[PDB]
Structures are given as structure tokens and as C-alpha cells.
Amino acid sequence: EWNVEKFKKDFEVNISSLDAREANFDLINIDTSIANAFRRIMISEVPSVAAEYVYFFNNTSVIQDEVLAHRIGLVPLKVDPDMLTWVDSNLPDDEKFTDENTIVLSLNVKCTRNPDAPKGSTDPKELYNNAHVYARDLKFEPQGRQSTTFADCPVVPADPDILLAKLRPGQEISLKAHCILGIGGDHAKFSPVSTASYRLLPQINILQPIKGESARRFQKCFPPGVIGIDEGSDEAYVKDARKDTVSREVLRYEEFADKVKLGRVRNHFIFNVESAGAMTPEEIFFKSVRILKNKAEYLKNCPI
Amino acid sequence: MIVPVRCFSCGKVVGDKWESYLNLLQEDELDEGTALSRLGLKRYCCRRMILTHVDLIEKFLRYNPLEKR
Amino acid sequence: ARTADFRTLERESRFINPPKDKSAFPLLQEAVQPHIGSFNALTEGPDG
């Protein structure tokens, strides 16, 4: 029989690393049906905040307005998604945006020629003033209660160095961007992960002994820290499977064609998660788990 | 024309690395693979986005209808 | 040795500052050399 208790006995997690952007960990004794659910929720269903509505007031630059709005929608914003609610689309445009669900960013930048530039200068930063527009130039314009709620943490891009646009003297950009909550299954700009995926733990079943110089070349067919030579007997053994990238270079030699079988542990998933910047990868994974549970609970409580 | 904000395949923000890539190519005498690795681009999907960018925006910008030439 | 190169720095420098003597692509002009030379031969050249 299968039971939640029998799953709780055998399931375990091995966090290999954890940063503010990337978290590498393991899920053991779980089914692909649930690991894939977690991965799909991380990529598509976990909400984040991105620029959606752009209100241009002037754009005399070479980049056209739709392209510039698309770029401004792509830049990730360091906003905690819980700090704002969801936009009610059915409401009219006047009352649709409010201080609890919309974040206003502005970008006003004019390019003027630098009258102190040296002769023979080819650097645009020395020839012109504001010849480059960066995501850091996206000022945050708090309105209403967010002037107090966001005082602890001002909204800035996760990558202020993103080169939004370039300018030349006389040219200018003046725009407002409205940032709301959305999910990545709608538009890829709301996806909060650079990439979240997994891979089964590789298995390297050595069938016959590889004693001798053959161990030197057999170990040469894998990533450096995967096969080792035993201190006692000159034998090859599997040190670390996680270090193996499955490239089957050993299979390309008929010497080992009947000495090793390459397989996988069909329940040992190595989740690698990277964050765009708005949330930590561990919190992304936690939110995906919670989303699956909450959607199941909504189905349970829905009348049939 | 101008560097893309994100990598097309995975979505990693690579729009803040074009100027650094040029700096590491010019000031440091780094080859393209070394510069891409030192920018943090490991997946070839992310490497291609910077390794193959053309940067036509600079050539577009020389035709300025708002300044005397 | 590398079979081909992207010439990133050279390309971006040339984009920034167009050459002041001649274009860097002579072959791109010999392609239209027939038409240019044919139109040139009717006003200049020997015999008037």
C-alpha cells in the first residue's frame, strides 16, 4: 500500500547549496509526477511584478515606443510580490490601478552634447550627456499608502546595469510604466526564475573490474570528480554521481562496451533553481509547493 | 539592434553584460570564451546572446534628425 | 589558430566611427563595379 506516512518515511531533501539567487538541492523518493508539478509551478504559476502598462509622453530616440516598452517590461523589479495585490481587470481604467496593486516607475532623460569633451574623443559617455539609458534610471514614484509601506524597501531593478536605450543630443525619453502582479504562464516577463529544472541522479554501474591502466582511461571518460582509483587495489569506483554530466563518452570505446551500464535513479531529482532577483530561490520553491497545495484545496472545496 | 534584456531560451538577464563584455575584450586581453565565463554565462544559450550580438544601434544613432551634422 | 572570428571589437569600433579614407569592404564595391563602370564609360575614358 501507499500512504502519506509511507511517503513521509522515505522522502528526504539534501540542500547542496543556497545563495540569494541560486539554490541547488535534491528531492529523493518522490515521483516525477510531483517533481514536474513543482518545476512547472516555479516557471509559470509563481507570481512576480513586471512592467505592464507604459504611458509614453515623448520618445525621440532611435528605439521605437513598442520596443522600449517591451524592454521595460522585461527588466525584473525587486518587489516582494506579497506587498501588492492583484489587479481586477473588469474594473474601468480609471479605478483599475490603486496604491495597493500598482507600482509607478518613471523615466525622464534628455541627451545634451557635452561642451567639455576632448577633441578626438570617441567615447559616447564623454561626447554626450546621458548617451545611455539604464534600468537604474527608472525612478520609483510612490503614491498613496505605499509612500509609507515601501519606505522600508524602495523599488529598484534587480539589475540596474541593464542598458535600456541609447540617446543622442536633442533626443529624449519621457514615460511612465505601471507595474502589477502577473504570472509567467501569461507572459514570460512575470517568470521569477532564470531557469528552474531538475535532472535524475546518474547511475554508473561498473560491471567488471577495470584494474590497471584501463582505470586511468575509464576515469578519463567522465567529469574529473566522478571516478577515482582505489588506494588499496588499482580499481575504478564511482565517487560522486552528481558530478557526472551524462555524455556517454565511455560508450564510444569498445573497450568498456561491456564493462559499464549508464542509467539513472528514477526518484532522485537534483533541482537547480536560479532567481531573476525579486525573490530568493528557496522562497520560490516554497511558494510553488504552497501553490500546488492551495490549488488542490480549492478543488476539494469547490462544489461538484 | 540593442542588446536584449534577457536570454531567449532560459530567460537569464544578459542585458547588463554587453558593456562589461566589451570592456573585458578591450582592456583585458581576454578571448570570448573566457570573457563569457567570467561574466557568469555558462549555458551556451546565454553565451550565444552576447557572443553573437551585433549592436546596430550605434550605426543607427549616427543619423540624428535633431542635431546639425 | 581559430578558423573564424566574430571581430566584435573591430566591428563595434567601425560602427562607432565610420572610416574617413575608404570603406573597409572592397569586395562589396567590385560587386557593383559593372554598373558603375558602364555608366562611367559614357562620359569619361579614351576617345572622349
Binding site: 547542496s16 547549496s17 541560486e22 541547488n24 529544472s197 535532472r199 567529469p223 552528481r242 558530478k243 557526472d244 554530466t245 555524455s247 537534483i270 537547480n272 | 578571448d31 570564451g33 565565463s37 555558462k42 551556451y44 | 589558430a1 581559430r2 578558423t3
Partner: peptide, 19 residues
């Protein structure tokens, strides 16, 4: 005929995720 010039300084670029 000279064979196609083998590029030099070829090192490992692919590593398992998290390493």
C-alpha cells in the same frame, strides 16, 4: 591538403548544475 586547423586551448565548459 592541410587538415582543418585544430583550435587550441580547449577546456571544459559544461558542468553539472549546482557545481
Amino acid at each position: 591538403r592541410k587538415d582543418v586547423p585544430k583550435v587550441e586551448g580547449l577546456k571544459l565548459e559544461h558542468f553539472a548544475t549546482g557545481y
